[PDB]
Amino acid sequence: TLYCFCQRVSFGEMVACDGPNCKYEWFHYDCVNLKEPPKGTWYCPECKIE
Numbered sequence: 001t002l003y004c005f006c007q008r009v010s011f012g013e014m015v016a017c018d019g020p021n022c023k024y025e026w027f028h029y030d031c032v033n034l035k036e037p038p039k040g041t042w043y044c045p046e047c048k049i050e
């Protein structure tokens with residue numbers, strides 16, 4: 001998926017977000033500094049400041 005602040009495809013790393021207002025739902029783990037697959041509803045830094 002082509003969604004991120006740096007705008008790049010999620011090649012092998014795709015973490016999905018839960019945000020009612022969120023076009024950037026898809027991300028890659030390395031951008032958002034993660035290696036753990038989320039155990040539940042993952043709010044991206046954008047949703048966390050909304």
Ligand SMILES: [Zn+2]
Binds near residue numbers: 004005006008028031
């Ligand atoms: Zn990125």
Ligand SMILES: [Zn+2]
Binds near residue numbers: 017018019022025043
């Ligand atoms: Zn979000």
